[PDB]
UniProtKB/Swiss-Prot annotation, chain A:
Outcome after substituting residue 75 to D: In strain: Alpha/B.1.1.7
Residues carrying a glycan: 23, 25, 31
Name the UniProt record assigns to this protein: Spike protein S1
Quaternary assembly: Binds to host ACE2. RBD also interacts with the N-linked glycan on 'Asn-90' of ACE2. Cleavage of S generates a polybasic C-terminal sequence on S1 that binds to host Neuropilin-1 (NRP1) and Neuropilin-2 (NRP2) receptors. Interacts with host integrin alpha-5/beta-1 (ITGA5:ITGB1) and with ACE2 in complex with integrin alpha-5/beta-1 (ITGA5:ITGB1). May interact via cytoplasmic c-terminus with M protein. May interact (via N-terminus) with host bilirubin and biliverdin, thereby preventing antibody binding to the SARS-CoV-2 spike NTD via an allosteric mechanism.
Cysteines paired by S-S bonds: 43-95
Origin: domain of life: Viruses
Record region (Disordered): 19-32, 33-46
Gene: S
Function, as annotated: Attaches the virion to the cell membrane by interacting with host receptor, initiating the infection. The major receptor is host ACE2. When S2/S2' has been cleaved, binding to the receptor triggers direct fusion at the cell membrane. When S2/S2' has not been cleaved, binding to the receptor results in internalization of the virus by endocytosis using host TFRC and GRM2 and leading to fusion of the virion membrane with the host endosomal membrane. Alternatively, may use NRP1/NRP2 and integrin as entry receptors.
Swiss-Prot record, chain B:
BetaCoV S1-NTD domain: residues covered: 1-249
Name of encoding gene: S
Protein name: Spike protein S1
Effect of residue 44 to V: In strain: Eta/B.1.525, Omicron/BA.1
Entry-listed glycosylation sites: 38, 94, 129, 198, 231
First and last residues shown, out of full length: 24 to 300 of 1273
Disordered as annotated region, ranges: 44-52, 114-128, 137-149
Organism: Severe acute respiratory syndrome coronavirus 2
Variant or mutagenesis effect after changing residue 67 to I: In strain: Iota/B.1.526, Mu/B.1.621, B.1.1.318, Omicron/BA.1
Region of interest: Putative superantigen: 229-249
Amino acid sequence: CTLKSFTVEKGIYQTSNFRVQPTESIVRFPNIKKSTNLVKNKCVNFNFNGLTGTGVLTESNKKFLPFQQFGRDIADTTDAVRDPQTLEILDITPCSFGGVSVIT
Amino acid sequence: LPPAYTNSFTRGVYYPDKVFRSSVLHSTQDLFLPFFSNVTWFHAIHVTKRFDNPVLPFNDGVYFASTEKSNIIRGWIFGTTLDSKTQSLLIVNNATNVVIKVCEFQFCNDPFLGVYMESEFRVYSSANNCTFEYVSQPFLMDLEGKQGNFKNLREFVFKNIDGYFKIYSKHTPINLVRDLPQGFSALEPLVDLPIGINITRFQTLLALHGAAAYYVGYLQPRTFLLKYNENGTITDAVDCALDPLSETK
């Protein structure tokens, strides 16, 4: 289909893209909004303090200064977020993982 | 004492936002204190006539440093005209805590809450209109009297943007008996006021026991180049417009 032909020659053709689909949709910060529990190691649709995104909220190892909300990297993108309720830090890792190529 | 200016050796640096970073060199463009500037040192060496606390022009930010440990300046009154028709603000470091009294204070001809408690009712006279009273956590501010070698480097930044009256601070246990020393230490945010009042001028309320020490900086829309470290705290910075070498850095 991507080649617009009924006969393909031997080779490796890149057909599609493949992105993991997020399962759940949590909403935080009624610490003192609706509440939902922490889920880890699974691609979800998180909403932390208005900041909306997608990823796997893994456990963090870095220590924030005790007034900081967000966290980021050289590429200027969200990487670690402060738990609004339990006041903990959680990493973020998006899971848009690679294309899909057919070998024939 | 006529203000004999001195050189602010890399002071007036503060975390400009809530973001955490690590080992990255971010270049913020915000209101800082120009490096190696002449700070309007209000020489409080009276043991002269340093009770020259006029309606000081509150520009877009003020670096109100103080190498004082008895905290002679318990109050900081703010306002535009200070004549009973302005929603005036007071940061009062009273016995309870750093209380934020912003109200439609009724003033007198000589506006100052002089020590008489701030009982000289020349700023506040009644509680008619009051947007918010941020009575902070009551801490051990009991009208301190300790003096000597300036351990507590009471640095403060008082800026008013979008109505918000952001008050930064820092407490460094560095020892000296004279003006702003060398070194580098960034300030932290201490309180953000979610009000929308306007301020034009301010005063410094020395406690009627004066021999003290308190400076007055003035900020500017500059651009910097901070340096965060592994633990995520500012360790160095360069003023992006001070010299050619700083500019190429």
